Amino acid sequence: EIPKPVAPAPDILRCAYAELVVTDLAKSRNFYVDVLGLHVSYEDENQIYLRSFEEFIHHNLVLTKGPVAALKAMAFRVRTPEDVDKAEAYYQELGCRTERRKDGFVKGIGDALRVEDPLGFPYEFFFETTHVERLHMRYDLYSAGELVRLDHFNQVTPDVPRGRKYLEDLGFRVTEDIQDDEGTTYAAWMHRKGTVHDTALTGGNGPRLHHVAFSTHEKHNIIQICDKMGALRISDRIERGPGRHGVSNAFYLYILDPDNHRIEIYTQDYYTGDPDNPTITWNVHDNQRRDWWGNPVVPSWYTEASKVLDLDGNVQEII
Amino acid sequence: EIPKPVAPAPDILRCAYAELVVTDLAKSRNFYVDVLGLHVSYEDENQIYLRSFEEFIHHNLVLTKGPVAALKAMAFRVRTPEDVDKAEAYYQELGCRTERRKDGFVKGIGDALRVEDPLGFPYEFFFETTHVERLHMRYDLYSAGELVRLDHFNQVTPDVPRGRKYLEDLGFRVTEDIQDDEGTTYAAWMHRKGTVHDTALTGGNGPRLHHVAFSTHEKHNIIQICDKMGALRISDRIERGPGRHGVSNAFYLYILDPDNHRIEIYTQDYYTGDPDNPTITWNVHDNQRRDWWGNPVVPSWYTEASKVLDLDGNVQEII
Amino acid sequence: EIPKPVAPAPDILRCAYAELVVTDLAKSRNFYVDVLGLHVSYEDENQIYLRSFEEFIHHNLVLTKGPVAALKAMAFRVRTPEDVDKAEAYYQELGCRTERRKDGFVKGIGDALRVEDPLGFPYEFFFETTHVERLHMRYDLYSAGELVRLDHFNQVTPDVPRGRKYLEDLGFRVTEDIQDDEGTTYAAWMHRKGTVHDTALTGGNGPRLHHVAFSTHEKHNIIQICDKMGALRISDRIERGPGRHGVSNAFYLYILDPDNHRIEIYTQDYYTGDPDNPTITWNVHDNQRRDWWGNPVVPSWYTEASKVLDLDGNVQEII
Amino acid sequence: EIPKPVAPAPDILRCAYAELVVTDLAKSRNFYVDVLGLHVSYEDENQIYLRSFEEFIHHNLVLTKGPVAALKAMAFRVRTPEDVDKAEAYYQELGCRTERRKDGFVKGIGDALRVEDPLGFPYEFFFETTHVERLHMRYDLYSAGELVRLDHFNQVTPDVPRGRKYLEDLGFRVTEDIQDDEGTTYAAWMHRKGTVHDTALTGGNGPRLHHVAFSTHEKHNIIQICDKMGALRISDRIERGPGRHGVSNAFYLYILDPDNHRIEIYTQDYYTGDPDNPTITWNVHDNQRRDWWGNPVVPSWYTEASKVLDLDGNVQEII
Ligand SMILES: O=C(O)Cc1ccc(O)c(O)c1
Ligand SMILES: O=C(O)Cc1ccc(O)c(O)c1
Ligand SMILES: O=C(O)Cc1ccc(O)c(O)c1
Ligand SMILES: O=C(O)Cc1ccc(O)c(O)c1
Ligand SMILES: [Fe+3]
Ligand SMILES: [Fe+3]
Ligand SMILES: [Fe+3]
Ligand SMILES: [Fe+3]
């Protein structure tokens, strides 16, 4: 069991960006820029910084050339600069390794803290970031499958209850969960920003990053991504969907990048900001909890997930 | 090989309606009316006459109570009254069994000819029909998953090449087909009205009705049908889809009625009205020919199909 | 200038419901339930309590039969039961008349505070409310023009800069505003929940309620409301739109109910939850600020708005 | 009154393309290609040949550089090469100037006949045309406001009844019209291809071209065109709409190109292919006949329209 610190939890606003290590920067760029249409905030020969259509912070996704494909950091923006200090004290009290860089770990981000959390994931907490042009009204750049915001991460861990209690201490609230008859949690969705989730815990060998998710405005935008991928003859990279999720009620699509990092395109969440928001508990045997339409969920979806790195860049041991 | 008659072929306009036999009229009404939203032109304790949102003839679907679930007739409307005379002459020269009725076989239809065509299917040709209120601007009745037109039929036959030649002599033009390296047709789509098809031949044990298809205005209308079915907990009746077809380029969904008759909901076809319309031939090994996004094709979709009746009301023998 | 109280402001979550007085309950029920499709949580011969599709609190709109059509209260839910006491102390320090009912002023709301705020508006603050069945996955009830959430109110007041400061002291953050060359604010949008706004101030004779807005999932849903009204032959009740707003970037529509209360249907907002969300200031002479497509602005839109009631039930005098 | 020829009328398939004369080829290219996204089949310094997404014939629109903007030709494709001959005999019997070119008047078109029809319009009839790659499944190219088909032309002429008769003898069928109490036609919509119209007559000083129309798959694509124009700051070129037409029931938008030629973007028509398709007659006083939502019809819409050229290249005198 992970103890609850005496130190006050940092006030987390929302998931902000993920930093993924990719093996071939040009193939990855072709997938994220030419196929998916994300907007390049900055790039050089080692890294590409991308942002979604409505974002005003520097980026939502950093692709870093690296020898082994993996999740290098999942970042959450905190409410004030002092929350970075709170995060540092908080994770130190939990006995976790932390690394603080006043100048940031990646471009566009200022004072930041990366930690190897209790579940083995590399989390970053930061407030400062360079504001860039919000492209929300740049309809001259709007693509038929435009990704408008980064919505959430989904982590794979062996002990979901244990991770659940840890994130609830951190301030995340469960919006929906999957439980057995005994009341044991099998998976949980938790938020800070007011949508169904900023992150989620799914049971399995971990630590591993299951996917990063972006949303679109409407359902036809998701359908265009599938049509485009079939026209580019890469439909084999469509893993699951499109479909309607039971948990979260979102219309979804799961596709795979060149390094097999899973990306989810999502839309039509509901508001969960009130403090007594009614948690929705689905039974582990309910066939409509994952796919509302009852579609069989691909085997690989449960088995394949991305490796994550510790703070020295080594791959975390999978349990 | 079916021979080409000397008598001129009747001018076929488009598929017009199908008469299906169902076993429990109340269960069927609940499906076609309460779930799918088709509009009742007329009904009594033995039959229900249904039309789509934009239709102006009496109906596109007749549900007839009967002992065994089956297709009792697939009807095509012809251009002029005299065309019913032509179809009669034509099918007699092919030595087919034909039954004529100046007063029709079902309400709403006038002088009609039914026949057991060469492939064993019960085709009806008619011109006269009672006009009813075209509901195309009845937005107060417009449902979120509204079916707006009857689009086509799809027949299962053991010898597609044979079937194809016959339908081509009848005036249908092939828009798309699937062939092997030897130039052998495994499936063909053919039209009269200017969309990709009015009917189609898929290979297998026949004669059997593979499905009847209706269209919607937009893609989200099809997604709504799935969502609605998941909410009524009958998602086990969603057979295949939704998806984008390779052949026809349509967005589609296949669902099963209470008697397992298969209904397809389809949208966004292209214009095939020009005489030199480019035929599109797909290779039997192209994984994108059926489902453009590469989705696995459900087994039942290839093996299950509805039985058809002869003019005496008996189930045609399957070959 | 309204002074900033020493008392802490209440923690406001979001706009929650409005209570409108209507003159003919049957006519209003026809407009809100039959035309618009809102869901009845409760109703008797004197009031109708309605909620949107994804709502879980008791209602988003209360129709109260009364002599003069007017806004009786615009309500905001606060984070904790204690925030109601903070709101009471806060408004008293401001010198406003306040009325506290531990049992609510309408059904489904518990301990609440109503006040005649500094601008003449009847605001209510409450935390307790009866939870009802969240219909977010009831696709069997989903209509083609489904209103899914209550989003914001828009208030008419003579002095925007004066009201803007008071609302900012209350904790609302300005997301977009319209200003002239001298930097004077002509209209402002402000929020608590993370969308562009929970309320907004537009300059004009007041206090008056300009409109209440609900949102839909997608753009076609707003188009359907227009189509259905044309089919019901009440297209004259369509006042402005549909269009794309410049400020807020939302797709919108304004319609008038039987008593001329204006309802806005809106969709496609962006996230404003970060504390340094960049404010977008539009110039008073930019022609795309109101309607991005440059459509002409209907004159009634600027002059007509609803009267508001003081706590005794009399129409507030308009300045 | 125009007499009915003895010679048989040519079998017209559908409107196929328009040749417009533009004063600045670069500006026109910018509008038609960069803003609207039409596809270039061929271009040089004097002309640009464009086609819609689903077209297979060489082009749907030809932009021809010239001193005075005007419509040089509105072309209809015929069913067989012989129909071109019938066309020539037919118009010659009507006493109209004709000009035949076995090699076509523009690239990609074969044996064609241009004439100065009875109303002063430069019509063209042709069968042969170079086929080009049909882009209907090129989703890699699909834009958010993709124009998919050329649908119709709309002509301005002083005597509508006079022209209606001549077009009906030509084989066009009236699907909808506007009449007064005396039964006098003020406007008519007529087709060949099975949609609401291939051409239409609106009373006014003529001959003049009112607009050429392209369609989109869904309503949101039309909305994107407006949004994009807003972003490019050319919203002043949006003339009327978006809206829902009463006549035709189509969702529409009218925009102006660099030389004021009017383009209509439109979607969701209904099938008019049956010979006894009910004609819908709208009363001249029905306020929903043009705009179903009852929106004011811009004055310019009624007064401005493009000049037409005679076979010599001179502007036809306007009556
Ligand atoms: O479909 C499922 O497997 C469950 C589910 C719901 C919402 C999500 O975001 C997700 O990633 C997975
Ligand atoms: O997906 C497939 O299996 C092929 C296909 C294409 C279009 C149709 O209408 C149909 O019924 C089947
Ligand atoms: O179009 C306008 O006039 C400005 C505007 C923007 C957003 C809103 O919600 C609103 O009610 C008015
Ligand atoms: O809205 C109108 O003014 C009449 C109308 C109907 C259908 C059309 O295509 C058109 O161009 C004009
Ligand atoms: Fe997810
Ligand atoms: Fe089909
Ligand atoms: Fe508003
Ligand atoms: Fe038009």
Element spanning B231, H or E = helix B219-231
A38: exposed, middle or buried (C-beta count within 10 Å: 0-12, 13-18, 19+)? buried
DSSP character string of D226-259: HHHHHHTT-GGGEEEEEEEBSTT--EEEEEE-TT
- Of residues B62, B144, B137, B138, the one with CA closest to residue B106: B62
Helices (H), D118-232: 160-169, 219-231
- Distance separating alpha carbons of residues D267 and D253, to the nearest angstrom: 9
Q: What angle in degrees, to the nearest 10, is found between the helix axes of A219-231 and B219-231?
A: 120
C302: exposed, middle or buried (C-beta count within 10 Å: 0-12, 13-18, 19+)? middle
CA of A290 to the centre of ligand 1 (A): 6
Kindly list the strands in the beta sheet with A98-101, ordered across the sheet, starting from the edge strand earlier in the chain: A39-43, A47-51, A61-65, A12-22, A70-78, A122-126, A112-116, A98-101
- Distance separating alpha carbons of residues A256 and B66, to the nearest angstrom: 50
- Which residues fall within 8 angstroms of residue B230, CB to CB, at 6 or more apart? A244, A246, A288, A292, A293, A294, C137, C139
Pocket of ligand 4 contains residue D117 by CB under 6 Å:
no
Indicate if C25 and C120 belong to the same structural domain: yes
Indicate if C21 and C67 belong to the same structural domain: yes
A122: exposed, middle or buried (C-beta count within 10 Å: 0-12, 13-18, 19+)? buried
- Rounded to the nearest angstrom, the gap between the alpha carbon of residue C15 and the centroid of all alpha carbons in its chain is 7
- Which residues fall within 8 angstroms of residue C196, CB to CB, at 6 or more apart? C152, C175, C176, C189, C248, C249, C250, C269, C270, C272
How many CB contacts within 8 angstroms connect chain A with chain C? 66
- Of residues D284, D279, D253, the one with CA closest to residue D266: D253
- Distance separating alpha carbons of residues A118 and A165, to the nearest angstrom: 11
CA atoms B180, B184, B187, B189: torsion sign? positive
3-state helix, strand, coil in chain A (%, to 5): 15, 35, 45
Tell me whether residues D142 and A227 touch, CB distance under 8 A.
yes
DSSP D279: P
Please tell me the number of Cα atoms within 13 Å of A259 on its side-chain side: 26
Q: Is the peptide bond before B207 cis (omega within 30 degrees of 0)?
A: yes
Pocket of ligand 1 contains residue A245 by CB under 6 Å:
yes
Which of A252, A269, A291, A301, when mutated, tests ligand 1's pocket best, judged by the most ligand atoms within 8 Å of its CB?
A252
Question: Residue A312's CB: how many other CB atoms inside 10 A?
Answer: 8
User: What SS3 class is residue B149?
Assistant: strand
Indicate if A84 and A120 belong to the same structural domain: yes
Radius of gyration of chain C (CA): 18
Nearest Cβ partner for A137 among D142, D218, D231: D231
User: What SS3 class is residue D84?
Assistant: helix
Task: Kindly list the distances between the CA atom of residue B86 and the CA atoms of B18, B96, B292, in Å, as whole numbers in the listed order.
Answer: 21, 14, 40
Indicate if D253 and D196 belong to the same structural domain: yes
Nearest Cβ partner for B13 among D136, D137, D273: D273
Indicate if C18 and C60 belong to the same structural domain: yes
User: What SS3 class is residue A188?
Assistant: strand
Tell me whether residues B137 and C231 touch, CB distance under 8 A.
yes
- Do the annotations mark residue B59 as ligand-binding? no
Which two structure tokens, joined as six digits, stand for B245? 């077809």
User: What SS3 class is residue B261?
Assistant: coil
- Of residues B230, B300, B240, B223, the one with CA closest to residue A286: B230
- Of residues D32, D259, D15, the one with CA closest to residue D143: D32
Taking contacts as CB-CB distances below 8 angstroms, the residues of chain A near C268 are 217
> At residue A256, what is the residue type?
L
Residue D2 within any structural domain of the chain: yes
Which two structure tokens, joined as six digits, stand for B7? 């008598």
Residue with tokens 């679930």: B69
- Rounded to the nearest angstrom, the gap between the alpha carbon of residue B102 and the centroid of all alpha carbons in its chain is 24
Task: Kindly list the distances between the CA atom of residue D8 and the CA atoms of A272, D94, D125, D164, in Å, as whole numbers in the listed order.
Answer: 70, 12, 15, 18
Which two structure tokens, joined as six digits, stand for C46? 């004197």
Indicate if B230 and B301 belong to the same structural domain: yes
Residue B317 within any structural domain of the chain: no
Please tell me the number of Cα atoms within 13 Å of A87 on its side-chain side: 31
DSSP B31: I
Residue A315 within any structural domain of the chain: no
Indicate if B304 and B191 belong to the same structural domain: yes
Pocket of ligand 2 contains residue B247 by CB under 6 Å:
yes
Among the candidates B111, B135, B159, a domain finishes at B135
Among the candidates D81, D111, D135, a domain finishes at D135
Residue D100 within any structural domain of the chain: yes
- Of residues C244, C241, C246, C253, the one with CA closest to residue C281: C246
- Of residues B176, B172, B197, B198, the one with CA closest to residue B188: B176
User: Apex CA B13: angle with CA B7 and CA B17, to 5°?
Assistant: 110
- Distance separating alpha carbons of residues D176 and D196, to the nearest angstrom: 8
Indicate if C99 and C152 belong to the same structural domain: no
CB C147 within 8 A of CB C160: no
Indicate if A62 and A167 belong to the same structural domain: no
- Distance separating alpha carbons of residues A249 and D75, to the nearest angstrom: 50
- Of residues D91, D89, D86, D126, the one with CA closest to residue D105: D126
Count of positions (residues) in chain B: 319
Q: Is the peptide bond before C207 cis (omega within 30 degrees of 0)?
A: yes
Residue with tokens 């940092």: A10
DSSP character string of A208-277: EEEEEEEE-SSHHHHHHHHHHHHHTT-GGGEEEEEEEBSTT--EEEEEE-TT--EEEEEE------STT-
B/e letters for B27-49, b = 16+ CB within 10 Å, e = fewer, are ebbebbbebbbbbebbbeeebbb
- Distance separating alpha carbons of residues D301 and D314, to the nearest angstrom: 24
Taking contacts as CB-CB distances below 8 angstroms, the residues of chain D near B57 are 274
Residue A11 within any structural domain of the chain: yes
Domain with A202, as residue range(s), is: 147-308
Task: Kindly list the distances between the CA atom of residue A215 and the CA atoms of A36, A253, D107, D153, D277, in Å, as whole numbers in the listed order.
Answer: 12, 10, 45, 40, 45
DSSP D100: E
Contacts of D among chains (3+ CB pairs under 8 A)? A, B, C
Q: Is the peptide bond before D207 cis (omega within 30 degrees of 0)?
A: yes
DSSP character string of A84-125: HHHHHHHHHHTT--EEEETT-SSTTB-SEEEEE-TTS-EEEE
- Which residues numbered 56-115 in C keep a CB inside 8 Å of some CB on D? none
- Distance separating alpha carbons of residues D251 and D270, to the nearest angstrom: 12
CB C196 within 8 A of CB C245: no
- Distance separating alpha carbons of residues B254 and B213, to the nearest angstrom: 9
Residue D319 within any structural domain of the chain: no
Task: Kindly list the distances between the CA atom of residue B135 and the CA atoms of B51, B118, B215, C233, D249, in Å, as whole numbers in the listed order.
Answer: 10, 37, 15, 15, 11
Contacts of A among chains (3+ CB pairs under 8 A)? B, C, D
DSSP B110: -
- Using the Cβ of D147 and the Cβ atoms of chain C, whether some distance falls under 8 Å is answered with no
Domain count, chain B: 2
Radius of gyration of chain D (CA): 18
Residue A316 within any structural domain of the chain: no
CB C170 within 8 A of CB C216: no
- Distance separating alpha carbons of residues B40 and B139, to the nearest angstrom: 16
Residue with tokens 């008392």: C7
- Distance separating alpha carbons of residues A259 and B305, to the nearest angstrom: 42
Question: What phi and psi values does residue A247 have, to the nearest 5 degrees?
Answer: -55, 130
Residue D102 within any structural domain of the chain: yes
Element spanning B89, H or E = helix B82-93
CB A63 within 8 A of CB A29: yes
Tell me whether residues C274 and A136 touch, CB distance under 8 A.
no
Q: What is the resolution of this structure in A?
A: 2.1
CA of D115 to the centre of ligand 3 (A): 52
- Which of A36, A136, A140 to mutate to probe the D interface, most D CBs <10 Å? A140
CA of B198 to the centre of ligand 6 (A): 9
Indicate if D192 and D88 belong to the same structural domain: no
Indicate if A107 and A156 belong to the same structural domain: no
- Of residues D52, D195, D278, D212, the one with CA closest to residue B195: D195
Pocket of ligand 4 contains residue D156 by CB under 6 Å:
no
Kindly report the three-state secondary structure assignment for every residue of A16-42. EEEEEEECCHHHHHHHHHHHCCCEEEE
- Of residues B148, B153, B151, the one with CA closest to residue B38: B148
- Distance separating alpha carbons of residues C111 and C104, to the nearest angstrom: 5
Kindly report the three-state secondary structure assignment for every residue of chain C. CCCCCCCCCCCEEEEEEEEEEECCHHHHHHHHHHHCCCEEEEECCCEEEEECCCCCECCCEEEEECCCCEEEEEEEEECCCHHHHHHHHHHHHCCCCEEEECCCCCCCECCEEEEECCCCCEEEEECCECECCCCCCCCCCCCCCCCCEEEEEEEEECCHHHHHHHHHHCCCEEEEEEECCCCCEEEEEEECCCCCCCEEEEECCCCEEEEEEEECCCHHHHHHHHHHHHHCCCHHHEEEEEEEECHHHCEEEEEECCCCCEEEEEECCCCCCCCCCCCEEEECCCCCCCECCCCCCCHHHHHCCEEEECCCCCECCCC
- Of residues A269, A222, A219, D245, the one with CA closest to residue C221: A219
Among the candidates C135, C159, C184, a domain finishes at C135
- Which of C271, C272, C289 to mutate to probe the A interface, most A CBs <10 Å? C271
Question: Residue D68's CB: how many other CB atoms inside 10 A?
Answer: 12
Tell me whether residues A292 and B227 touch, CB distance under 8 A.
yes
Question: Residue A232's CB: how many other CB atoms inside 10 A?
Answer: 16
Question: What phi and psi values does residue C107 have, to the nearest 5 degrees?
Answer: -65, 150
Helices (H), chain D: 25-29, 81-93, 160-169, 219-231, 299-303
- Distance separating alpha carbons of residues D102 and A302, to the nearest angstrom: 65
Nearest Cβ partner for A230 among B227, B238, B244: B244
Indicate if B171 and B284 belong to the same structural domain: yes
Tell me whether residues B140 and C231 touch, CB distance under 8 A.
yes
Pocket of ligand 2 contains residue B291 by CB under 6 Å:
yes
Q: What is the CATH number of the domain that holds C12?
A: 3.10.180.10
- Of residues C192, C171, D177, the one with CA closest to residue A271: C192
Q: Is the peptide bond before B242 cis (omega within 30 degrees of 0)?
A: yes
User: Apex CA D285: angle with CA D281 and CA D290, to 5°?
Assistant: 65
Contacts of C among chains (3+ CB pairs under 8 A)? A, B, D
Tell which atom from ligand 2 comes closest to the C-alpha of B254: 11
Nearest Cβ partner for A218 among D140, D220, D232: D220
